[PDB]
Subunit: 284 residues, 2 copies
Amino acid sequence: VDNSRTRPRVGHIQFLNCLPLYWGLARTGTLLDFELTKDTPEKLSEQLVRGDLDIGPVTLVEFLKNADDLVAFPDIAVGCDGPVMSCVIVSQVPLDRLDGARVALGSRTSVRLAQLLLSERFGVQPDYYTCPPDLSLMMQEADAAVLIGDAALRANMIDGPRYGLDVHDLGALWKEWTGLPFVFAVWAARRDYAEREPVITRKVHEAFLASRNLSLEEVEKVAEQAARWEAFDEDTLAKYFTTLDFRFGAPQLEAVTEFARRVGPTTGFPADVKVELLKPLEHH
Amino acid sequence: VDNSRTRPRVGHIQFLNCLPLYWGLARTGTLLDFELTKDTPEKLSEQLVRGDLDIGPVTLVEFLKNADDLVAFPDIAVGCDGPVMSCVIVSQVPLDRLDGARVALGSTSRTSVRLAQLLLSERFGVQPDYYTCPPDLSLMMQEADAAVLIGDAALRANMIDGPRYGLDVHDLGALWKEWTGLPFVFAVWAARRDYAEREPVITRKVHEAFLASRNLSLEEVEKVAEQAARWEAFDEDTLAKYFTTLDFRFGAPQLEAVTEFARRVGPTTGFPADVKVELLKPLEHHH
Ligand SMILES: C=C(Oc1cccc(C(=O)O)c1)C(=O)O
Ligand SMILES: C=C(Oc1cccc(C(=O)O)c1)C(=O)O
């Protein structure tokens, strides 16, 4: 019987927003300490919650709904301070004409944020419905659409300009409304894994920080390589990678707090839900 | 419509025998040009053959059966010159007592299983009653007299379980070496013919990146084994020895081994004894 220690099962968002981080994990060799699963952010959240991953990214809403069972990594997240570029509202009309109009969404956090903004900032109540991210399809059936990930980035930088569609950056809309940054996803460990294997959890956290730091220093190398496989060019990817904000300190947490307070009672978690952070090792 | 170019779908054997290569693909950044799939060798061969992968490792037998539709990469393979350490026969009795005896064959293997049957029948002259089952040494040893394992399971049987329980472990790479004086090739890297023709430069760059990644894996083998030992029952010395015993060359001496093995097993495996192996031709230059 092979009772040797086993690698942590670590998830990783397949979209461009975490491609530089993947570059970091590969260049540092960190990937060989992981049992990696690449998928979409909503699937990776499902897996971690139900126990198919030990550590991985969790879209903020799904983290808040499971905050008692997850422990978030400090100093790394997927967020923005102003525009986020990859979370948008695409609209054929000004936003203030969406009351009673049809708005298409996406296959959990950004959708709630868009609904928060439209209802509580602009004061419109649209007839929402969910459909797969297809800007061309959405524009025929609805007045506006909510896209995330690469689709929103494509809508923002390519499709939007080509077809003369207003693209509203949800991160900028939030900033304008509150002056705050925004956090869309965090990294967490399952509580039970964090408690059974504290040092593995700790070193996974440190390896994510090291890989994230390397991804910032070599962002140009990442964008050059990635441009060969994307409709986006190297400049566009470099701008995207550098606009993304991967910090998770005090200003980001307060943004999480206030967002939770405004959407909690209508999303499925307490407005004052507590976010437990992986405590660093004390020394003597 | 996003008509941009897409990454090749590249397979990768999940066992330890290709972990240093994985270190190479990650450290070189090559991984970010692949859409990688990790699996067992028999699954990856099925996937490439049916079209779920563009490029990937193919266990030799399955490559030969599909030689018209696959183009093998030169100068990289999974092989040995002597012992391979991770392709073995585990037996409670001497091999010449296996005639009519029960022998289990691990499901994930196609080449090593055929090689073992070749050796037992044509070298030792025994005809055992084989059956296929998933790789579980503890289970195999209770129901059968001998077992054929590959990958990490065979590596564990050879280095750990065998000595602990006093089981004879026969290295299939050495048995072949003794019999023929030749090295052996268990798996090659190939591109689908249709993918190689539609995307010649991508195919070439994937090949070149595999060579560079393999070369880095040899130079930093100790770093790979040190890191890998933390997650395995094997220690760093054992893994380092394993990685350096594995032979990743695929030149002229390795091909003759492929040729001769094909000739001896072809008419009993499902391909002509003189099946042609098409290799990715290098680009000529003229300055
Ligand atoms: C940068 C992004 O921000 C995210 C990432 C993951 C999930 C969500 C969500 O809203 O659930 C948002 C992006 O999607 O590219
Ligand atoms: C070095 C090995 O040789 C192999 C590799 C891949 C497939 C097979 C097979 O038997 O099909 C054998 C190993 O398994 O570690």
